[PDB]
Structures are given as structure tokens and as C-alpha cells.
């Protein structure tokens, strides 16, 4: 027999780092409502210091979503370790591919779930920013492997505007490695 | 428990580690960043610079301080107590409140 | 309130960085400097040697000052905004 | 089908490396008026002080054009930040 | 302009850069080519030693002289001119 699955919203193939990441949903299935998206560049081992976005996303009261270069183990600890306490769920990803390009659908996405465009190779920093930068979607299922989106926040104007900007660049000049890969 | 030291060395226990309360509920990876400050348990038995000789100095014992922590400074689990003596330089600033 | 210092120990606030008016803003990023600018908090009691008993004070609280670009120069975290410790000797010049 | 192109002055394949540089003309395409010309024979990237000779140029309201081989980390990331708020335009 | 450094460490601004001197007829060849001349902006009253209150300078106050480019000159911005701090040690004949 045939398998038909249809996958909407917003879906990346990449694992969390940290098996305690079991929600509360058997079988290791997560689920997270109204989340926080945020972007970083940067592997956070030496400043080891999130601790005011934590603290002002644990005022907040929500859980979270952090898309980065990667988590050092020491912080790994406390993010994961804190989770559990239920302060703020937090959800760490891998980057899903190649850099540049990559990074420009992240901030699609961001557009999308309503999310500032944030780069940190650009003069705004991690932990200097404003609350409100935080991107958020109604639903986000998370697995092993595939993390989801059901339905996001961000304005049809937008999203058609970024459809409008990327359509020439549906054709290019790439042809068959660029065409398909963009549509 | 009190043993005296002399001079420069003066002994004082290191502030708490293990952040309890230091921050949210943020626990503290192997990088510890921890116990900047302390509470002298005696100090030493004072100067000697030509008849100067001893001169009692603003901190006495109880004082609950900020401290240099660097090499100068000797640790030992002694007397069933974390005692480090330190130098007359390696206080930086005391305040009790 | 206060944290009293001991001898030869000056405590200041260290001042934020600011942007040149060279074009609007222009903000530079993680990029340290020396502390050209700070506040003092308090001042140490001075110098002791051959009975140096009290000398007066190079300072008075309140005052901008210019201190060494040296690594001795401690900071320290206190409630609210971090704050910076030096010997008093430090001091290079004052601000006006 | 064959198609011809006519094209006037000089025309070279390079384009920004950061996509913030997308200035206000969007939709590919980037015309700017009346820029300026800078040629320099090493790679420029930490004399970051040369600011206020280009800002005379921006503040009388026309962008300028950067001829380097490659500028730093730094200087790059405050030059496209500069760009991007609309403090200069530069290309 | 109103910086007044005391003690030891003493303001002195930098000459003019690029000086017409180096090379004779031609000018200073740009490669790694530094003067040691400098004016004097303010010095301090003194140092305190040996129960001496002040130790009186005698250098003059604004008054060019040469100075050793070492470690110990610490040049500062002030007012968009740069000018650097030492104490007596690098401080070299008057001019």
C-alpha cells in the first residue's frame, strides 16, 4: 500500500541534540503552542550567557524555538536541565543546509511566523534586541528528525510580496539544480 | 578553627558556589564564574615597616568583602573548613549590609 | 549605597560606548576599548608607607577621570549595571 | 530564437556579497545617480577613519562606489548596518 | 583641550605628521618612518615621594621638546587630536 502524508507550514529535516527532549506526548512526540522563533549565528560556548533572553522569555511565560549555530554542552546543560523544570521550553535545531542560502529562507520563515530578520553577522547582537523580535506560530511538531509547522503569524501581503520577489528567481539561469530545488 | 595568620596573609573563607539563587533557575556548567566575594575569617597579625610596625587595617573578622582571586591566594580544606589566605592587596572592597 | 573601599582602592562606573557623530550614528560591535570615561564610586584611603598615615585625596567622588589601560584593572558584578576596581595610583589624568 | 544585447560602458560579473546591500530599488535591479569612483591599490579592510571623506559625499545626498579588494569582518558588518538604517549608500 | 594630567604622567601632543625633513629635498618616505618631537600641552605639580609633597618639574609648560616613542606613551583623542600620556622617563631634551 501507497503512504499519502502531507507535510504544510514550514518543515526542516534536523534532530534535536538533546534526547531529553521527550515532551510530554508518548512515544517522544513534541508539541509546542505559540512558541518564540529566534535566529543566531553563533555557537554559544563562550558567553555561555543567554540567561536575559531566558529570563525575559521566562516573564514571558512561553516556550521557544532557537535556531543557531550550535549549543555548547555546558549551555546544552542548563537549557535542556531548565526545560525540564518547565520554565520555558526550548527547542534547538541544526542549521537544515548549505549557509547562505539556507539563512535567506530563515528569514522567509521568520517573515512568515512573524519574526524580525536577524543575522548576527550584522551589527545587532543575541541578547541586545527587543522582545517582540520573537517569531511565533500557532502549532510546531516536533519528532526525531522532522520539525513542522501547521499554521504560522505573519501578514498574506508579505508572504506574497517575498513570493513575488522570488518568483524570477524560480527560473534564473541554474535551470535544473536551482529551478526545482527553489519551487 | 581560628588559627592566626600574619602580615599580608590573611585568611577568609570564599563565598558561596553552587548557584542556588545566583540567576533564575540557570545551573552552572563546568565554566564557573562563581564566588567573587567572601567573608574574611581573621586577618593576619598585622604590618611591619620600620617601627610602623603593626597597623590594624579596615577589615576585621565576619567582614563579608570582594577580594582579588588570583595565584596569590592559598586554598586548603583544613580544620574541616575552606580557608584561603590571601594577601593585604587581594581585597578589593568591603561592605556590610 | 556605597561599597567602602580600602587603601589605595578606587571603584568607578564604567561609561558606555559612544557613537561618532562622523555620519548618522555609525555603531561599531564587540569591539573593546580602553575606558577612557567612567564615574567614581569611592577612593581609597592612600598611601601608608613610612608612616604615610593619611595623605589627602587625589579625588573627590563625583569626578571623570582617565585611569591606566592595564589588566589590573578588576571588574566586578554588583545588583544592576557591573562596576570596575583599580589601585588608586591608576588614575592617569582628570577630565577637566 | 537568437537574441542581441548592446552594452555601454564598463561592465563586469560581481555582485554584493551581503544581501542587505538590496537597496531601495528591489526587484533585481539596483540603478543608482550620480555615484563616485574610489581606486585603491591594497585591500582595504581596518582604516575605517577615511568615514568622513565618503560622509561629505552621503550627507550632500549621492552614494559613492568601492573599489577593494576585500574589507574585514567588522568594518564590512558597520559599512552594510550604515547602508541598511540609511545613514550612506554605498556600493 | 582642558585635560590636566598630574604626577608623573604628563600630556604632550604629537607634531605634525608626515614632516618635510625626512628625505631632504623629498618628502618623509611613507615606511615606518616616526619622529620623536612633541609640545607639551600640562604636567602635574609634582610626585609625592620620600615625605616630599611635590616634586616640581623642571620642564617647562608648553614648550615643544622630544620625547622616546615607547611603551610608556599612551596616546589618547581629545577633542579629535591625539595626544599622549607618560610620565618623565620618555620625556627627552626641549625643543
Same mark, same amino acid.
Given at each position: /500500500?501507497?503512504?499519502?502524508?502531507?507535510?504544510?507550514?514550514?518543515?526542516?529535516?534536523?534532530?534535536?541534540?538533546?534526547?531529553?527532549? &521527550?515532551?510530554?506526548?508518548?512515544?517522544? *512526540?513534541?508539541?509546542?503552542?505559540?512558541?518564540?522563533?529566534?535566529?543566531?549565528?553563533?555557537?554559544?560556548? #563562550?558567553?555561555?550567557?543567554?540567561?536575559?533572553?531566558?529570563?525575559?522569555?521566562?516573564?514571558?511565560?512561553?516556550?521557544?524555538?532557537?535556531?543557531?549555530?550550535? +549549543?555548547?554542552?555546558?549551555?546544552?546543560?542548563?537549557? +535542556?536541565?531548565?526545560?525540564?523544570?518547565? &520554565?520555558?521550553?526550548?527547542?534547538?535545531?541544526?542549521?537544515?543546509?548549505?549557509?547562505?542560502?539556507?539563512?535567506?529562507?530563515? /528569514?522567509?520563515?521568520?517573515?512568515? !511566523?512573524?519574526? !524580525?530578520?536577524?543575522?548576527?553577522?550584522?551589527?545587532?547582537?543575541?541578547?541586545? *534586541?527587543? @522582545?517582540?523580535?520573537?517569531?511565533?506560530?500557532?502549532?510546531?511538531?516536533? #519528532?526525531?528528525?522532522?520539525? !513542522? &509547522?501547521?499554521?504560522?503569524?505573519?501578514?498574506?501581503?508579505?508572504? /506574497?510580496?517575498?513570493? *513575488?520577489?522570488?518568483?524570477?528567481?524560480?527560473?534564473?539561469?541554474?535551470?535544473?539544480?536551482?529551478?526545482?530545488? @527553489?519551487? | 578553627?581560628?588559627?592566626?595568620?600574619?602580615?599580608?596573609?590573611?585568611?577568609?573563607?570564599?563565598?558561596?558556589?553552587?548557584?542556588?539563587?545566583?540567576?533564575?533557575?540557570?545551573?552552572?556548567?563546568?565554566?564557573?564564574?562563581?564566588?567573587?566575594?567572601?567573608?574574611?575569617?581573621?586577618?593576619?597579625?598585622?604590618?611591619?615597616?620600620?617601627?610602623?610596625?603593626?597597623?590594624?587595617?579596615?577589615?576585621?573578622?565576619?567582614?563579608?568583602?570582594?577580594? #582579588?582571586?588570583?595565584?596569590?591566594?592559598?586554598?586548603?580544606?583544613?580544620? #574541616?573548613?575552606?580557608?584561603?589566605?590571601?594577601?593585604?592587596?587581594?581585597?578589593?572592597?568591603?561592605?556590610?549590609?
Amino acid at each position: /500500500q501507497d503512504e499519502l502524508d502531507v507535510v504544510e507550514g514550514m518543515q526542516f529535516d534536523r534532530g534535536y541534540l538533546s534526547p531529553y527532549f &521527550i515532551n510530554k506526548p508518548e512515544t517522544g *512526540a513534541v508539541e509546542l503552542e505559540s512558541p518564540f522563533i529566534l535566529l543566531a549565528d553563533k555557537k554559544i560556548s #563562550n558567553i555561555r550567557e543567554m540567561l536575559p533572553v531566558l529570563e525575559a522569555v521566562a516573564k514571558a511565560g512561553k516556550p521557544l524555538l532557537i535556531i543557531a549555530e550550535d +549549543v555548547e554542552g555546558e549551555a546544552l546543560a542548563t537549557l +535542556v536541565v531548565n526545560t525540564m523544570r518547565g &520554565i520555558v521550553k526550548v527547542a534547538a535545531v541544526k542549521a537544515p543546509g548549505f549557509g547562505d542560502r539556507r539563512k535567506a529562507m530563515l /528569514q522567509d520563515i521568520a517573515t512568515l !511566523t512573524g519574526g !524580525t530578520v536577524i543575522s548576527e553577522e550584522i551589527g545587532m547582537e543575541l541578547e541586545k *534586541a527587543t @522582545l517582540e523580535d520573537l517569531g511565533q506560530a500557532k502549532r510546531v511538531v516536533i #519528532n526525531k528528525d522532522t520539525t !513542522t &509547522i501547521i499554521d504560522g503569524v505573519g501578514e498574506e501581503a508579505a508572504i /506574497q510580496g517575498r513570493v *513575488a520577489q522570488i518568483r524570477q528567481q524560480i527560473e534564473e539561469a541554474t535551470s535544473d539544480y536551482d529551478r526545482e530545488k @527553489l519551487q | 578553627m581560628n588559627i592566626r595568620p600574619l602580615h599580608d596573609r590573611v585568611i577568609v573563607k570564599r563565598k558561596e558556589v553552587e548557584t542556588k539563587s545566583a540567576g533564575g533557575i540557570v545551573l552552572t556548567g563546568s565554566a564557573a564564574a562563581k564566588s567573587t566575594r567572601g567573608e574574611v575569617l581573621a586577618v593576619g597579625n598585622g604590618r611591619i615597616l620600620e617601627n610602623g610596625e603593626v597597623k590594624p587595617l579596615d577589615v576585621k573578622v565576619g567582614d563579608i568583602v570582594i577580594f #582579588n582571586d588570583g595565584y596569590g591566594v592559598k586554598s586548603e580544606k583544613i580544620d #574541616n573548613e575552606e580557608v584561603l589566605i590571601m594577601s593585604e592587596s587581594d581585597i578589593l572592597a568591603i561592605v556590610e549590609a
